[PDB]
Amino acid sequence: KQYIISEELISEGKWVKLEKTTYMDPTGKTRTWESVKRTTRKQTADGVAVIPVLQRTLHYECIVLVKQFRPPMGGYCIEFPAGLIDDGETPEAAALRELEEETGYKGDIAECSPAVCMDPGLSNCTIHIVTVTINGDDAENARPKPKPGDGEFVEVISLPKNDLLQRLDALVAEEHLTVDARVYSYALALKHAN
Amino acid sequence: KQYIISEELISEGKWVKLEKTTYMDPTGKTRTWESVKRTTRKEQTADGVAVIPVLQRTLHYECIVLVKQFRPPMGGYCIEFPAGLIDDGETPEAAALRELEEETGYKGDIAECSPAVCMDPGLSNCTIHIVTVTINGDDAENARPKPKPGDGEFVEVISLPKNDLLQRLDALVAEEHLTVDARVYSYALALKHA
Numbered sequence: 001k002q003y004i005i006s007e008e009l010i011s012e013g014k015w016v017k018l019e020k021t022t023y024m025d026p027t028g029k030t031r032t033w034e035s036v037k038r039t040t041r042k043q044t045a046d047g048v049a050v051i052p053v054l055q056r057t058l059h060y061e062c063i064v065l066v067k068q069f070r071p072p073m074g075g076y077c078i079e080f081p082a083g084l085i086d087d088g089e090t091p092e093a094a095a096l097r098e099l100e101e102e103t104g105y106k107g108d109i110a111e112c113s114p115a116v117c118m119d120p121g122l123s124n125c126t127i128h129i130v131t132v133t134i135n136g137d138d139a140e141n142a143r144p145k146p147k148p149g150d151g152e153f154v155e156v157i158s159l160p161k162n163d164l165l166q167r168l169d170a171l172v173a174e175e176h177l178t179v180d181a182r183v184y185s186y187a188l189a190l191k192h193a194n
Numbered sequence: 195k196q197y198i199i200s201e202e203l204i205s206e207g208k209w210v211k212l213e214k215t216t217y218m219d220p221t222g223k224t225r226t227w228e229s230v231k232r233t234t235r236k237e238q239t240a241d242g243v244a245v246i247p248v249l250q251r252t253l254h255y256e257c258i259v260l261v262k263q264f265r266p267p268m269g270g271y272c273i274e275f276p277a278g279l280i281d282d283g284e285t286p287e288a289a290a291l292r293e294l295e296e297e298t299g300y301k302g303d304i305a306e307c308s309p310a311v312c313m314d315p316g317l318s319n320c321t322i323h324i325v326t327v328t329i330n331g332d333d334a335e336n337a338r339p340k341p342k343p344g345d346g347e348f349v350e351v352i353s354l355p356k357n358d359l360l361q362r363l364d365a366l367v368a369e370e371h372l373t374v375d376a377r378v379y380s381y382a383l384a385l386k387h388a
């Protein structure tokens with residue numbers, strides 16, 4: 001019933017562009033929307049985000065998150081490890097690569113989502129959510145070395161899975177960080193389960 | 195360590211703007227970023243709300259109430275938590291309850307309200323509160339709920355059992371071209387992982 005008629009370029013940067021989208025509303029009336037897109041899409045999606053389950057015997061299972069300065073937010077955010085998918089890279093490979101560069105951990109793929117949208121009222125941006133386990137008892141994950149690319153500066157924060165929502169709430173209250181909505185949604189569901 | 199030095203307007207729409215952000219990196223070097231923001235944020239603690247609406251009814255499994263709508267930035271249909279922007283002077287809770295009623299017809303009761311969480315912090319400053327609301331589906335008000343769409347709003351309600359949400363979403367994606375929202379998928383994955 002609804003569909004895109006045309007897209008008008010408004011402004012194109014190196015990384016991001018803004019378009020004016022014309023679309024048919026379901027009454028047969030023509031309407032416009034201000035839409036954001038990345039200029040980098042090739043890929044199944046723009047990016048990947050990794051849900052990294054750190055498994056160490058005799059410890060609680062942890063979810064590994066990252067903290068970085070985010071210029072659009074003007075502050076520090078707590079997020080799943082994540083990055084854009086390289087041209088000709090599979091989402092699974094992007095997931096292990098980004099996880100290693102951002103955290104130093106070497107993980108194994110558990111499952112991979114379909115492309116999912118980030119903020120569909122605003123942008124066309126999509127990601128694959130890739131669940132990865134990390135065997136924290138393996139020697140390669142003993143002293144995990146983060147490999148920050150040029151212009152990346154990432155702190156690693158591992159939080160127990162069974163208390164994740166309360167641990168995040170505490171970080172927000174004391175550290176004045178912004179938690180990512182996907183991470184928050186994951187944490188809420190861990191509490192809402194059963 | 196890191197902070198914003200300047201924000202230069204590149205292009206300003208009715209709803210969305212694009213900025214060149216200058217910031218200080220942690221080595222002490224000046225760098226730039228292309229940043230998206232909405233034009234509609236005033237004194238609100240966030241741009242919008244998304245609602246996690248848990249439909250509860252005697253002798254029924256709990257359901258998660260979702261909405262399906264055409265999203266012009268995506269060029270197609272998306273499955274999302276009910277959501278909208280917070281009106282000026284409106285609380286996030288009030289906005290949640292109001293958007294849930296407008297989009298679904300249901301009258302919920304507040305359960306919890308998140309701090310402001312970021313939508314896509316490598317791209318935009320956009321933030322929401324995630325508001326958990328229970329719906330008493332035994333109450334007569336919630337028997338035959340009718341959405342009250344705004345001008346240009348055309349929303350379908352999809353209620354899925356919490357106990358099988360991820361599979362039910364996968365089955366929806368298998369049957370039509372539609373995209374699931376990343377917060378919905380994250381919530382569904384944690385329900386499985388718990």
Ligand SMILES: c1nc(N2CCC2)c2nc[nH]c2n1
Pocket residue numbers: 032033034035121122209210279
């Ligand atoms: C048109 N209307 C929008 N509104 C949000 C409430 C109506 C919008 N948001 C991002 N781009 C947009 N273009």
Ligand SMILES: c1nc(N2CCC2)c2nc[nH]c2n1
Pocket residue numbers: 015016084226227228229316317
């Ligand atoms: C600068 N660099 C960006 N990226 C480095 C990897 C994507 C970017 N993304 C949105 N805006 C941006 N401005």
Ligand SMILES: [Cl-]
Pocket residue numbers: 053110131387
């Ligand atoms: Cl898992």
Ligand SMILES: [Mg+2]
Pocket residue numbers: 081082083102
């Ligand atoms: Mg990253």
Ligand SMILES: [Mg+2]
Pocket residue numbers: 083101149152
């Ligand atoms: Mg990177």
Ligand SMILES: [Mg+2]
Pocket residue numbers: 276277278293297
């Ligand atoms: Mg809405």
Ligand SMILES: [Mg+2]
Pocket residue numbers: 277278293296297344347
């Ligand atoms: Mg609405």
